[PDB]
Every structure is written in structure tokens, then in C-alpha cells.
Swiss-Prot record:
Postthymic T-cells. It catalyses: L-arginyl-[protein] + NAD(+) = N(omega)-(ADP-D-ribosyl)-L-arginyl-[protein] + nicotinamide + H(+); NAD(+) + H2O = ADP-D-ribose + nicotinamide + H(+). This is T-cell ecto-ADP-ribosyltransferase 2. A lipid is attached at S223 (GPI-anchor amidated serine). The active site is at R123, S144, E186. One of its GO terms (biological process) is NAD catabolic process. The modification ADP-ribosylarginine is found at R181. It comes from Rattus norvegicus. It is found in: Cell membrane. Residues 38-215 form the TR mART core domain. Its EC number is 2.4.2.31, 3.2.2.5. The chain holds residues 24 to 246 of 275 of the full protein. Belongs to the Arg-specific ADP-ribosyltransferase family. GO terms for cellular component: plasma membrane; side of membrane. Transmembrane segments: none annotated.
Length: 223
């Protein structure tokens, strides 16, 4: 099983105070990520084509650019697994993290698209999660979820071997208009949101409540 805690070793940059500097530097950072991350480069090039098609259908927040849209599209893609891993195991060895620009653009995309809105979402997994009694929980890595418990419990994401999270989030963003699969009613949650109330029920249900934004362990690391 996997441990559920405050994600002490996860890269959790919120970029407080360095948004302007990052938008200027992230483009070169992205080329660097690409030069050492073939899978990301491929996933990005494909996400860009899809973004080009998505963009014309709606207006986006002031400042939301193609990097933001492409990063969000790519995340609902297959690159999500390796990216989440890289972020989760960051502190383990930060020297080989090749999502410097990607992480920034995805984080900023969610910040630009976020409002006050809180949601009741569900997340199903096939891997069992054990709450290690830290006192609160953060996912650390970005994590997808669905407004529909049915979607979350589908054989696509869930199994008896796994866990069903019942989450109240207030930083999560509804990104239906970015997902490769539009029936998922996906809500994307940043890894730095904290759940002050944690309750395990039975062998595979975990209720995460009292969401709150709190400072991250890392800030503007690559700025």
C-alpha cells in the first residue's frame, strides 16, 4: 500500500512572489525539460495540437496562455503518471527532476482558473492508501478526481485492492474543457491543498475534509 500523509518530500511549489519571473524563464526551462525528458516532449507536442483545437471554443483568464492550456491538456494525457511520480519522489533526489517548467505551467494554469468554488469529489484507485496519522493530509502531487462517485468507482480507476477518496476541495478546478475524456467530469486538485479532517472508514474509504490552503515546503525553487 501507499502512505497518506503531509507529503513532506513532494515538490509543492506554489510560486508565491515569482509568477512574473517564471513566465519569462519557464520557456527556456521547458526546452531543458525536453532535452532530458523524451516522453514529456512527445506528450507535449501532441497536447499542443489538441490545445490548438480546444482554444477557439472559449475565452480564458487574463494571462492564461498556450503554455497553460497545453500543460493542462497534457496532464489529462498519459504523461500524468510519470509526472506525479517525479513530483512525489522529488526530495528523494531533486537533481533529476525534468518537469521544472511543466510543473510551473500546470500549477499556474490551475491558479488562473480557480475561484472560490469548493466541490464534493471522488477519487478511486487500485492501490490501497494507509493514513499514517500525521494529523492532516496533502496529496503532494496533482491529483485528478470526479464530481461523480460512479465515474470514480468504475473499473477504470477502482478495485477492491484500492481506495475510494471522498474529498471536499476548495482549490480544485473543474477542467471538463481540457480532458481527453469529456464524460469524466474531472476536477484537478493541486498537491498543496491541506485536508485538516481525515477519516478512514472500512478497508478502502477515506474521507478528506476541512480543506485549507497553507504554505508549501518549496517556493520559487527554480525562479
Amino acid at each position: 500500500p501507499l502512505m497518506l500523509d503531509t507529503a513532506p518530500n513532494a515538490f509543492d511549489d506554489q510560486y508565491e512572489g515569482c509568477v512574473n519571473k517564471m513566465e519569462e524563464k519557464a520557456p527556456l526551462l521547458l526546452q531543458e525539460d525536453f532535452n532530458m525528458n523524451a516522453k514529456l516532449k512527445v506528450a507535449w507536442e501532441e497536447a499542443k495540437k489538441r490545445w490548438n483545437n480546444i482554444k477557439p471554443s472559449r475565452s480564458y483568464p487574463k494571462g492564461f496562455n498556450d503554455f497553460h492550456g497545453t500543460a493542462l491538456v497534457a496532464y489529462t494525457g498519459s504523461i500524468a503518471v510519470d509526472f506525479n511520480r517525479a513530483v512525489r519522489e522529488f526530495k528523494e533526489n531533486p537533481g533529476q527532476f525534468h518537469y521544472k517548467a511543466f510543473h510551473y505551467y500546470l500549477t499556474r494554469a490551475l491558479q488562473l482558473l480557480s475561484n472560490g468554488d469548493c466541490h464534493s469529489v471522488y477519487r478511486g484507485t487500485k492501490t490501497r492508501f494507509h493514513y499514517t496519522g500525521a494529523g492532516s493530509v496533502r496529496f503532494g502531487q496533482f491529483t485528478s478526481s470526479s464530481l461523480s462517485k460512479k465515474v470514480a468507482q468504475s473499473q477504470e480507476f477502482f478495485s477492491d485492492h484500492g481506495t475510494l477518496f471522498i474529498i471536499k476541495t476548495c482549490l480544485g478546478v473543474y477542467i471538463k474543457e481540457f480532458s481527453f475524456r469529456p464524460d469524466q467530469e474531472e476536477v484537478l486538485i493541486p498537491g498543496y491543498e491541506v485536508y485538516q479532517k481525515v477519516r478512514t472508514q472500512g478497508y478502502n474509504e477515506i474521507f478528506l475534509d476541512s480543506p485549507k490552503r497553507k504554505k508549501s515546503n518549496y517556493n520559487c525553487l527554480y525562479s
